[PDB]
Amino acid sequence: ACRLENLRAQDPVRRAEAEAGFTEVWDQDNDEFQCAGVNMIRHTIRPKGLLLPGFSNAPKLIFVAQGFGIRGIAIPGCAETYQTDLRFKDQHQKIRPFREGDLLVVPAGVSHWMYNRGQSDLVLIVFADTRNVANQIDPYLRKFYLAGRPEQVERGVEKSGNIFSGFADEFLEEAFQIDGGLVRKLKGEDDERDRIVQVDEDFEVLLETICTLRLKQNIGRSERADVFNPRGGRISTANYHTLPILRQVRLSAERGVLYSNAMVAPHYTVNSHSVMYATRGNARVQVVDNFGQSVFDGEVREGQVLMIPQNFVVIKRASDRGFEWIAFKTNDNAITNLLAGRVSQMRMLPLGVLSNMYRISREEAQRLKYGQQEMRVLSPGR
Amino acid sequence: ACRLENLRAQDPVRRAEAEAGFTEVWDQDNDEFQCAGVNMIRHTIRPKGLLLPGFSNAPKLIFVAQGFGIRGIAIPGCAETYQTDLRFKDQHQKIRPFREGDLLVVPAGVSHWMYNRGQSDLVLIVFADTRNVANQIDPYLRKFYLAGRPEQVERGVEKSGNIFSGFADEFLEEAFQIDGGLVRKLKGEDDERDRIVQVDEDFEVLLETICTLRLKQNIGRSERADVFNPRGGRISTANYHTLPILRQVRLSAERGVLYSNAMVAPHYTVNSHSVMYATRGNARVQVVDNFGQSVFDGEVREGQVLMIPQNFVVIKRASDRGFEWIAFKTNDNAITNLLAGRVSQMRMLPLGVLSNMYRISREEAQRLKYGQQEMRVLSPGR
Amino acid sequence: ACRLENLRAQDPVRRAEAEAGFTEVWDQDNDEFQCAGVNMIRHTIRPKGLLLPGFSNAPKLIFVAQGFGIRGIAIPGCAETYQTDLRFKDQHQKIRPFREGDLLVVPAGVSHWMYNRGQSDLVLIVFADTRNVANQIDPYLRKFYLAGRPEQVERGVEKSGNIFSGFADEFLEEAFQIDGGLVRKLKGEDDERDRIVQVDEDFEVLLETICTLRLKQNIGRSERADVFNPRGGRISTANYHTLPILRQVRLSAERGVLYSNAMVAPHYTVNSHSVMYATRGNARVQVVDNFGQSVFDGEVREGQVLMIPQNFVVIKRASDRGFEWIAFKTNDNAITNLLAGRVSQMRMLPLGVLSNMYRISREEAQRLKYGQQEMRVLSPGR
Ligand SMILES: [Mg+2]
Ligand SMILES: [Mg+2]
Ligand SMILES: [Mg+2]
Ligand SMILES: [Mg+2]
Ligand SMILES: [Mg+2]
Ligand SMILES: [Mg+2]
Known part of the structure; x- marks a missing residue:
């Protein structure tokens, strides 16, 4: 039983301040939304800001309303290794840039991050569908972060952390072959920046057929x-x-x-x-x-x-x-x-x-x- | 939890009299039906009767139990313009005829109308599936009529009208470029004929690959x-x-x-x-x-x-x-x-x-x- | 709303003794299972044991943990007639053998049986998905047996029998063209063996593109x-x-x-x-x-x-x-x-x-x- 007798022009319902910007989320319990299984999020990332990487149980479409930046969107089994400039060295994923008018795609279970490389505020309109074939759990949105310690408001209902903080120190030291001091950073116990952090010092990075399709379109x-x-x-x-x-x-x-x-x-x-x-x-x-x-x-x-x-x-x-x-x-x-x-x-x-x-x-x-x-x-x- | 311990040989549960015939609907709340997400409707259209055009949120299959007539079933993006006989003129959709034994198809969101051109009563057995992939709302059947003022019983639960009566006079006068006297007719404020009206005076009409497939089969x-x-x-x-x-x-x-x-x-x-x-x-x-x-x-x-x-x-x-x-x-x-x-x-x-x-x-x-x-x-x- | 805050290492919850072995089923009401729409069953078939044929409303995957045997899995419209050895005679389905490490498949609505031809106990790990596209009823598992009188525990909640015991003697005598003494056996009124019976005397059997695909893989x-x-x-x-x-x-x-x-x-x-x-x-x-x-x-x-x-x-x-x-x-x-x-x-x-x-x-x-x-x-x- 869907209650579609009184639609309403909705405004975000919750806010979450981060070091380098903030995040607003609409009321997922709104009758219209609930019926269609949709969620709305608006990220406002200030200059030099990085939205830590995380993945969701639902597909997402993201509209760049203002600004421009670079993203990193993996995608399972998709070979994407790339060797940076003067190469000591580093191997990483494709560095994908985007600007206003860009409609970016983020498949379910795929982690991604975004960084504001411009001087104006980077505003992102995130649309998620929980009643999507891709999500096998429930009509409730979940974001799994890889780093930091974010106040889970992408759905709210708690000392929520990143996927590593729920794991035993020993286990993580082996899997990664690292010292406990690193497990401490990984777990991000003290990180109080939330999901959008300030990029420190300098950020130089700015260069199966499924693995070849475009992940965005400018409209x-x-x-x-x-x-x-x-x-x-x-x-x-x-x-x-x-x-x-x-x-x-x-x-x-x-x-x-x-x-x-x-x-x-x-x-x-x-x-x-x-x-x-x-x-x-x-x-x-x-x-x-x-x-x-x-x-x-x-x-x-x-x-x-x-x-x-x-x-x-x-x-x-x-x-x-x-x-x-x-x-x-x-x-x-x-x-x-x-x-x-x-x-x-x-x-x-x-x-x-x-x-x-x-x-x-x-x-x-x-x-x-x-x-x-x-x-x-x-x-x-x- | 589906209650399938006591199936029953169901009879229509509600009736709606129209000018040119009537409409009977089965109990959508029946346990069997509810479990399968089905609805049954039987239309009895008398000679010279027209079942006004409307569309539903669910696919429909219609069995012609008695009689023969012509229908008009649009289908989105499907070019179907046709120029009538002695052509002043008129451009319209394909005029599709049908007779007893015909199993007609009506995709979701597609409007259609039917007219009894015979002298016997035109009896139609309409089967709708609400748990069909095509419907993204809820297991509840909805019919959106374009003209008239029909007592919504295709599901019941109210001064229900056609899709236009919910719109402001101004808005409709612009969209169509017409006078308010026409907006009055459009909204069908006074129409008391229900969904099956009597065709007045004379009815002469009786002549993307998706746009080419057959929409019926006689069984x-x-x-x-x-x-x-x-x-x-x-x-x-x-x-x-x-x-x-x-x-x-x-x-x-x-x-x-x-x-x-x-x-x-x-x-x-x-x-x-x-x-x-x-x-x-x-x-x-x-x-x-x-x-x-x-x-x-x-x-x-x-x-x-x-x-x-x-x-x-x-x-x-x-x-x-x-x-x-x-x-x-x-x-x-x-x-x-x-x-x-x-x-x-x-x-x-x-x-x-x-x-x-x-x-x-x-x-x-x-x-x-x-x-x-x-x-x-x-x-x-x- | 899926309750995935407290997963647990589950043990079977119910047991059903049969003549030639037993059957254990996990708690389908477990929060994890309920959310994913899964069921677990473990069959332990002793030597010379036959798991009577039945079909379910949900697809199944079966893992052979121990032993080896032969199965008979029909599959709709798939011509599979075969003529036994010295041929008086008999026409039957393909006799499919399997051993440890075999991951067998059983599509929904398809009946199958299994027989332990070895001397060790045949242990089968059955996995069923009720939230599978193939099941149009409800997230509740149902097995329809063709013979015997099994205590329905594959889901529990009753004098449950086989599909024939619900039919009138007359009806069954015609459909099959047999005497009432046979309708008695068919209905299995007195069968007190449950679902895994002891194969009597001797068991000699041991020899649309869809109809050609493999129904198992050894992993x-x-x-x-x-x-x-x-x-x-x-x-x-x-x-x-x-x-x-x-x-x-x-x-x-x-x-x-x-x-x-x-x-x-x-x-x-x-x-x-x-x-x-x-x-x-x-x-x-x-x-x-x-x-x-x-x-x-x-x-x-x-x-x-x-x-x-x-x-x-x-x-x-x-x-x-x-x-x-x-x-x-x-x-x-x-x-x-x-x-x-x-x-x-x-x-x-x-x-x-x-x-x-x-x-x-x-x-x-x-x-x-x-x-x-x-x-x-x-x-x-x-
Ligand atoms: Mg719109
Ligand atoms: Mg593993
Ligand atoms: Mg039938
Ligand atoms: Mg528009
Ligand atoms: Mg696992
Ligand atoms: Mg039949």
Whole structure:
């Protein structure tokens, strides 16, 4: 039993301060979220900040809202050894860079880290699905950290540490072949920095077919938009057709842009939920259910999240300031049907049927289907 | 915890009168149904009747028990524009006709409508699966109508309307580029016809590889039967091998016919449930569980539904009047193992094993496996 | 909500004596098991013993811990008729033999039987997954027997019989074309032998592409090991790459061997649970969760089961007597990431990152990643 009668424009619910930045998490107990099995997290990493490496029981999609940095994402059995510059030496994983507009992927059980190499704050919008095929435990999100001693808030409910602090000193000294002084550091008993630490002194690093697929796609301003309306705005899709790895995690996203008074035509997604996060501006959004009842009718403002349930019809209209968002989909290929427009449910319908449907005349029925010239996004024609 | 100790021959539980016909729905809270995540609906559309277009969160299979008509089933991204006869003009979807014996398909999130073009009553047996991969909400069925103001009984639990009545007048006037008088019709505020309306005056319409697959298969009298016994009756299968689109919705069906005193040999389906709906006559049916206990032993009469749980052994015997049914399967390819017959679990067994199994002799064991000459259906050999 | 805070080294919880041996079952209500949807059963079949044929609603993997015998596993629609030796005659299924080290497969809904043809006791470790795609009922295990009258303990909660005892005498006499005296034997009303009966007098039997795939793989001593450490021990994998049929049931296993004081390096499986059953010796095992808390820290002794949750880090160290186990995986291909070793999460990490991670120096960070020479299993380097 899913309670989708009162959707709400959600704001983060908890905060966790770290040495080099902070972490905000949404209410996983929200009825919409609970029903779809989603979690939202926003990381704000200050310059020279490093988000320690950890892995989760659920696939993640991460949207870079601001800044640029480098990440390290392993991936099981994937040979990735690399030899640094002047090579004494070191062998490491590929150093992957990213910038604003980047939609990064993180498969379940895969550890990763991120570092802000820029001077502005690195803001990351993390979307996790717990009802994903990949997670065999429960609809509850878990992050397993490799270093540090982080206050587990990615889900909350406790002196939580990293995966090593639960192990016996002896055991760890053997496995790694090290002294107890090292087991102390490993366990990070005293680390009071949390999950985003300050990178000390200097950071020089800045250079089975599965092992070859791209782990990101930029759906930002500096890329073509699949749906484009010069006067209205646009939507840039990132599904498995454009990013193969998406078929694996079974997630996808849409980055949308609306100009002043621009409106997204009524529609619903037939095969997935749509966890919308507003990245800029604000808009009036209306969602309706199968009862023909309004389950949401208000404003979504920058920094907020509105979970649009699968099949629920919706309509969006940006404020004078315009509206910009990143919509995560719980399917590798979200299909959106239009109710009004060049290609609509309406257009598909015979005039004879539309007539009897709305007790209108074949002529009025005509103004009904052909009256709308545009497509997905509508240019200020209020 | 599924309560499958007391199956029952179910009758519809609710009724909804419409202008041009009515709608009956079974008890979705029935223990069998609840466990399998199934819903049953029977539409009775009178001549000149139109079942307004709507879409559901779950895949549907529809069996035409009586009559013939035309449907309009869109399907996302599937170009389907068509230009009517003397073309002023109109562009619409393919006009798909159907007759008795037709097993129609309706993928989740796809809207469709049906119209009775015949003079007899058009009777439709709708089977919906909510525990289908395609539905990401909950095991509760939802139908989203595009026009009218229908009393939501496809699940019941309220002034329920169509998807537009939950939207603001302004919003709808823009999206469609219409006057408020039209928004009034669209919202169908006063429509008191329910879901099956009377087609007014005259109805002339009567003419990505996914977009090319068949959306129906006739498993009626005018088609060969995969399993046939001249003296007993037969069973016509409709799985993904015969109808590709079935692999998508992950449903399939079997239309069966039994002559007087004909019996379907004991058997169980290894990979799915079997939601049997009797279309004619009646029969004595016995189901047994893994405890060797009878979980059903009685009569299934025309118009009733018996949900045979996966792996449950069953036996059927038609009355003197014979027995005819349409069995929906919750898998694209239901596999049925036989207990007695030419190809049986018994036949596969070595006489030495059968002996020790039933403390009988190799000779008696012989009369046990080879004693049954026939196959699936058995001709009156009572 | 999965309770994985207190894993435990489980022992069977119930016993069922049969004529020719006995059956032990683990507590399916155990929190770990319940969360992963697993069941454990151990059959001990004495010489000349036959485990009557039955089928389950869930896929099974069976490990032969001791002895050797022959089985009969049908498989739906798979033509398998075979004509015995001096042929009066008999047509039966393929007679499949097996020995110690054999990991047998039993798809859901498929009946099978086993017979001990050796002189030692035939010990079978049966692993069943109820949360497997193949089972459409509930997370509760069910076995449907064809003969005998077994006390249903494979799940317990009753005069439980075989699938025929729930059917009317008349019905069974027709289906099979037999006398009521035979229906009496079939129903096994008086059979008081339970599920493992004594094979009487003499047992001579001892000779769609799906129908051609292997139904077993030996991961015992007389086979190469994918992971091998001369001084430590090894692990023999059985996934879909080595046994195709595994991709169907979506299960796999690992047979491991540890020499005195040998240790399995820290690690976690990213895509499945690991239901470990100790076949010999004992070891100290430590599991840690995402909170960095120890959710298990003790001894696993021969005959016991420890369910290692997905993503949970673990470490194993054999006693002086060594440790040997069979680990069932709830996925057709369990991927294990290493924390310390030649190919580790550690090795993948840049020295610069490891430094800031454990507030250690680039040199100490060096001894951290390259300090461990070995791989999965570690030779006594305590
Ligand atoms: Mg949109
Ligand atoms: Mg959205
Ligand atoms: Mg049948
Ligand atoms: Mg049936
Ligand atoms: Mg291991
Ligand atoms: Mg294990």
